[PDB]
Amino acid sequence: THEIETVERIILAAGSSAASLADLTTELGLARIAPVLIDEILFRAEPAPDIERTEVAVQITHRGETVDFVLTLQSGELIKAEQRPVGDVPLRIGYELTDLIAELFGPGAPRAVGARSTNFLRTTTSGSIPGPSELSDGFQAISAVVAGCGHRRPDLNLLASHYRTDKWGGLHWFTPLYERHLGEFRDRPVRILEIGVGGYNFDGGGGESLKMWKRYFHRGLVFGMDVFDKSFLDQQRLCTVRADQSKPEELAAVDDKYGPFDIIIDDGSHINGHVRTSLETLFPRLRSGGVYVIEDLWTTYAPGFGGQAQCPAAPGTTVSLLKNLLEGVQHEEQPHAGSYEPSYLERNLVGLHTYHNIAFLEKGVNAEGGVPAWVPRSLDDIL
Amino acid sequence: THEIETVERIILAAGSSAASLADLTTELGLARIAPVLIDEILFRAEPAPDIERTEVAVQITHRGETVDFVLTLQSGELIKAEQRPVGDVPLRIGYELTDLIAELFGPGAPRAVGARSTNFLRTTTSGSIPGPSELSDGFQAISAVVAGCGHRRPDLNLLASHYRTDKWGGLHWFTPLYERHLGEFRDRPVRILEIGVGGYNFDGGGGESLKMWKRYFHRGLVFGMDVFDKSFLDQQRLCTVRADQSKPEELAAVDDKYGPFDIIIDDGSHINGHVRTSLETLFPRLRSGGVYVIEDLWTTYAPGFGGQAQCPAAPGTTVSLLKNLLEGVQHEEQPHAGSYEPSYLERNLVGLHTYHNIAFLEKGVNAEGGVPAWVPRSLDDI
């Protein structure tokens, strides 16, 4: 929890004042911040290009202190980093700590120039003209690390295919919809909760969507909730929590410890009652201006999921809930006793987006007022 | 019809090849195109700033030919243009015809530099530092005209307030939602249909929203359908049509004459049956990738509009329709005991956006396939 807190403080400083970032850099120090930034460069530079073992140095300096890391990249292998000297590495990237913190965790347009220093094959051990492979592999190696040092907008469809989540590809085509409804939050220091880590009780299974969310939300903290243990996936900005979406107390404990959440995604049991329980408990805890997403609406018709093989969808099914939420947004126009008090969902659901197998709920203040009484409601009133 | 066609050709060439624009400029000529561009400038420069009567010259040149216009701006007065010599007018703007066509009807980011020439008070009415009012009115006048010569993104909320449509302000707050769902089409040569011009049978009334759509869609042709005549609102890129949204034949005639439409907006009678008839007839005619919008969902509960004062909403009411459209998007996941072929709305509705008093329908191909049979449907399958 102190670890998540330290990464968060760096993320927030990246988007704050110069004085705030200076205070944090002075407080934590280069030795402590550097490894967090190298961890990000490794996660973002993946995957390594199809090249022979090639070393690339990253040097971070701050107020007279400098730390050097040598990253090793090779076709089909996890990129590795080591705090080591760089004098014999002809591929080098240099950064002021303030610049690298912004490059990785800063909001706003990626910088096109001036964020770093570069040394590319200024000396070659081969001879005078560097070998073809040496030159080719060099270009690819330094380019891969540079790509991992920044926050250039990624393509969520490509990320989904790379991390192997079923949010994109033949089973579902949700990623462009996520870009539409969540893209305005990409530069924001978000806390995202996804219910359903993936992999069920299979050992070593799941986390694909969580890694995608970590990559897309460069300033985000990703939380994954599952009834089964997923602690093996825990990493920088990615925390798994063991909890049951059927139990309101367990849901509230997740929010009490890791919330509040800007975005909540239901991709869990798909059991009709669990979807409803999760929305009733977490929608009031969701940040106002946030988005609640329900994936796999098809379970509405599957008895094995507490659904009913009937259309219109049976009450207590996800499609019936979505239809009621739709009418709820119009609560102020509905016939009601003056004493009527709107439900939480009626007052706090400002937008409903329904697509195939997915719904997006926008939380906000639904209180613009019903059509005034002085508006004609009949030709009788017109006349 | 030839007039609407000429403006359309200019708009389409503005986003085409150099050869296509060259061919159109050669065929129509400067004398014909320039008045279309001046009309746009007058429409987009409005309103005139709070200044005393001030003249600004606009000169358009093309392949050895040049035409001069002098615009007159004054507080509270309609901006006027006359084809006259620039002469002594000390506020001047010059353009190559190609640059002005792109500036007014071109897609893409507004140019920040190099699109025109300018002369500002090289000669004053004193012979030296101009009078305080001459300088202030001069800056305001030339700035107003230049603003009218481009396609810089407008604020739809401010346009709705300026043109006085109820789409924004206290009765409704729809304009930001329109920006969200129609913003991607602002650079497109769209044909927009709004059912409901406004003003009912009152003389000289309506057209506020149509003027807003003309200002927002700088490459768009705006069509307003109304059961009553609204020909007095007719102007460049803005055509009114007399037709009844309750009658499928009249809706089809509107589409056959002025379609197809990228965007259709129902802001008409608000009578439940008319909303259903308009959607059933025009949704199939809407361009795929287009957006159908229904305003005033409240009439769902008003008996005077064919509504029923009950909740859940009665069958045959707009909210009930929206709930059925929502379920139809999931048609591939629904149980179908025998041969089923999806309805048009099930197959062509890809997205439903429901807010307070407004719904946005995205038309497309809804055929990604239902969940495959090999997917577990129960722990017994597990």
Add this chain to the structure above:
Amino acid sequence: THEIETVERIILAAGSSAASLADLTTELGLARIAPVLIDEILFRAEPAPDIERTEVAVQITHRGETVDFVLTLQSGELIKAEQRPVGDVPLRIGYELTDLIAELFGPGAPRAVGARSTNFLRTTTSGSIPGPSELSDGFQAISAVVAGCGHRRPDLNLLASHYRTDKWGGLHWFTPLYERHLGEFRDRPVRILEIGVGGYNFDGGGGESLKMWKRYFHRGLVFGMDVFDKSFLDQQRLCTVRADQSKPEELAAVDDKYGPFDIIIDDGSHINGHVRTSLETLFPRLRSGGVYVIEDLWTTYAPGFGGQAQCPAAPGTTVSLLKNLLEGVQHEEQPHAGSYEPSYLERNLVGLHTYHNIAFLEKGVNAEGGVPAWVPRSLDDIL
């Protein structure tokens, strides 16, 4: 200085974590934050529409505390606000304090829905159908206040015409260039310095550009430096400083007290030596990744400005400086003794943008390395 500090803390919290904003709201309290937000609504809602005197209520609530303000709008008059009851004002806007802080000072896309509550003529004292003026003036009045409650992107050309600065209109056409080079910083908590407040020694003169920068940078602190007093213009997010751009010590004192600056604009004396002194002293103090802007390059040829009526421009003139800066960006490719050490401007100028009467300097690390020795430099080397 405690005032600037308090507005800054609110601005930074608007773009931080939920916990950070909660901590600040709890610390300062609604009573202290509310007036800062009302001050912004008045500055941004200006000008009032051409309407008869109309009242619009803004109500801000936070954790069981609520404060009500009544804004009065009238054709040709400064919008006024008073902490007052709202029961008899039929035009009302309601906000949670967290939502209003983000709406005014938050980074990111303006919210399209759910940020506030609205009451529009639910009761009219006139009768049942409100009068035409009453209805028309109402629409305009509430719309104007709503526009002042947010950060919807403004048009810098229109702002320049409204505030009456010569950056746009016949004398200059710089505002679209400012949008191009400074637009990526609009959502950033910037500190901007403009040298030249305007109005010279004329009493009550100047500040037009400063008000424009305050309006455009909704999260920004605007600083205006002038040899003459301009304290009468001082307001929320807008501080004037008496200092001389000819004196390096006075320039450094401005940066020591109000810096560091993300953006510095020279629109002052236009005296060739003052432009050079200002750039030599403040470019090293400018934030890396920031922009230095020099307006009115025409003084390069005006003897009355220490210029020379000659072309090519004489050494010590702004155009000559810009040409040397241009060559300086290529310092690594220039013939030099190996011992050569790049100047500050050579090492820290990554981009030079020259337009008519204006130049934009991008500060960053100019250290990608010169063309390697192993690159053929002659057909002799080729053969």
Add this chain to the structure above:
Amino acid sequence: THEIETVERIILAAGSSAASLADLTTELGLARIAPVLIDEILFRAEPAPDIERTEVAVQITHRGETVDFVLTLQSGELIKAEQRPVGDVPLRIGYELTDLIAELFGPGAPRAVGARSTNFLRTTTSGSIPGPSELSDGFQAISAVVAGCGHRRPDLNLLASHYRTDKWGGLHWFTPLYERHLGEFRDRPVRILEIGVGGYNFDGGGGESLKMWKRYFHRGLVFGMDVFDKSFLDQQRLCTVRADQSKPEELAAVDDKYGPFDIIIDDGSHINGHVRTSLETLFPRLRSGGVYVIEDLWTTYAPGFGGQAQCPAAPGTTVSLLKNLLEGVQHEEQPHAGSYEPSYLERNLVGLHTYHNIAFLEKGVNAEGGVPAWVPRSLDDI
């Protein structure tokens, strides 16, 4: 020439009216257009994912006619397409011709939903939950093809690395600067000229940058000029031309045949005189609002490239030229003792962008007027 013209007509119609697209689809027909679209899909879907041989079907329909293609993807292998029946292929993508034309060559935001149909493993090779590799390879294959069917914004840095051009990586870092200055033209039907195809006189060499420009400008026609033959690189939207940048007649011939150009990039000999000759001849031919780019400013100091090893840079060297262009932008503010008429570069250069080893020149109208005579020029004037 007719082939380049047919692809150009398709691209222009993709951003035109419904009527214009309808007319082109009727005139050319599905049989003619579909192979152009399949060629784009193969170019944009590359590279194939690291999978075992997998087939993906693409079906395009138009007014009662439908054609089927089966694409084959395999690790390290060139993606192949064949016009064959979809048959049993379990990975399928369907498109209406109009939707596919817009998806590949349309301007504007990529569509997030409704642009196509899809079938994914409705039948597996086991009869039940597909084999682990069948499912993984299936997701990768269909995703790769769908990616190739659209105009989603690419990362120019990644494209430069994928196509292996030195515009990015250790020798140069220009691609983000290209995104800044050319990004606004990505949705435009551009004609781009790069002087310098690459590969010199080595057999089979060059074209890396030309392939990058084709991928980035999804509506663009790419032209590569080189003194040596590069016809082997010729492909859809990518034409090589043999011409000498030292010879004004050859540069004019390139423009007369394949112009006018929205963007011209000098990455050729790097010989100082050739850079000056190319700019003097082609800048007047460049579209106003267009961008002229000069790479490799370092040759300014290299005697083997006509440079002089001195600083300040010698007259007749590229850096000296850039310094003179910078001063020319201020031509209206310069003292002119007698009648002066500005040069072409003074009148048509509106912006100069100088970075390390690269310059971006914006062409436009540089005529805002010098400072008016009534402006004080001295405290004596004050």
